[PDB]
Write a protein that binds this ligand. Structure first.
Ligand SMILES: [Mg+2]
Ligand SMILES: [Mg+2]
Ligand SMILES: [Mg+2]
Ligand SMILES: [Mg+2]
Ligand SMILES: [Mg+2]
Ligand SMILES: [Mg+2]
Ligand SMILES: [Mg+2]
Ligand SMILES: [Mg+2]
Ligand SMILES: [Mg+2]
Ligand SMILES: [Mg+2]
Ligand SMILES: [Mg+2]
Length: 228
RNA sequence: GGGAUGCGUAGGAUAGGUGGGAGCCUGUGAACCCCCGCCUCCGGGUGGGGGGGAGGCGCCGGUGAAAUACCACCCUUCCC
């Protein structure tokens, strides 16, 4: 069949006609985590926007109240003293334009890139075609470009996530782990939804949150009332 | 309501987008072989019947603008 026995059992646990409250889903989603690791919990929403126009894009970051339950390998590219501000903030890999060469050669061992605006000329032109397609190019809207490198790094290390609608008008984010207590999952989920709504495009017509789902890495989805 | 889509070059090859992902499937039957429906760019994709009887997939690496298992929300175009 299309799914293995493990996944089939999980499918029994969901009412496919029910719209769950966030509180309920918080509990349920933990039951939907039966893979052989501590599964990330995810939220997905179908947005009432035209992804074809940039002025109706939804893109930002939100600090999850309870963090991500995952460490983020952070590479910072900075010039001068900012190089130390970076290291001190806890950056995994630190460097200036010199390390651009490493990435040009194929080095990709990191999850997030942050940089001072003053290296963004080189980063953009040298790394743009490498980091861009990977959604790893530092960017104001992603909160990954700034002179306050240490504050950015700390926010990211503290559980700040980025979200950006895809070309189909959908949007997705990790919001914790199946090991989180349900109340904490619930908080993180709301935090994300709130951040989403704070980025509703003025021009967006009709229901913004057309649908909102919660799920686990390897499990089925649960449809939720975003305002619960 | 149900199901599949998606093929420049390179790449094992028909790579839809994004997000998750370090695991996934498998005596509730792997590889492999035969047959069939639908689709087909004639490569295959996808679903199923029969045989078979324990391995298969991903990661890694490689190619690439992008990387594949698995899962989720969607898109396009299509079927029932
Ligand atoms: Mg194509
Ligand atoms: Mg293509
Ligand atoms: Mg994917
Ligand atoms: Mg990814
Ligand atoms: Mg058999
Ligand atoms: Mg069989
Ligand atoms: Mg024959
Ligand atoms: Mg066929
Ligand atoms: Mg076949
Ligand atoms: Mg048999
Ligand atoms: Mg899922």
């Amino acid at each position: 069949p299309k799914h293995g026995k493990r996944y089939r059992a999980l499918l029994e646990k969901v009412d496919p006609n029910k719209i769950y409250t966030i509180d309920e889903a918080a509990h349920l989603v933990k039951e939907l985590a039966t893979a052989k690791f501590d599964e990330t919990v995810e939220v997905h929403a179908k947005l009432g926007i035209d992804p074809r126009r940039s002025d109706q894009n939804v893109r930002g970051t939100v600090s999850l109240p309870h963090g991500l339950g995952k460490q983020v390998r952070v590479l910072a590219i900075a010039k001068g003293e900012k190089i130390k501000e970076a290291e001190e903030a806890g950056a995994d890999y630190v460097g200036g334009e010199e390390i651009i060469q490493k990435i040009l050669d194929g080095w990709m061992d990191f999850d997030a890139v942050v940089a001072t605006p003053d290296v963004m000329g080189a980063v953009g032109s040298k790394l743009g075609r490498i980091l861009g397609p990977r959604g790893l190019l530092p960017n104001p809207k992603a909160g990954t470009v700034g002179f306050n490198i240490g504050e950015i790094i700390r926010e990211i290390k503290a559980g700040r996530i980025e979200f950006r609608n895809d070309k189909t008008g959908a949007i997705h984010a990790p919001v914790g782990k199946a090991s989180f207590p349900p109340e904490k999952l619930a908080d993180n989920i709301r935090a994300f939804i709130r951040a989403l709504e704070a980025h509703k495009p003025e021009g967006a017509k009709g229901t913004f949150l057309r649908s909102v789902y919660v799920t686990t890495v390897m499990g089925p989805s649960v449809r939720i009332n975003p305002h619960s």
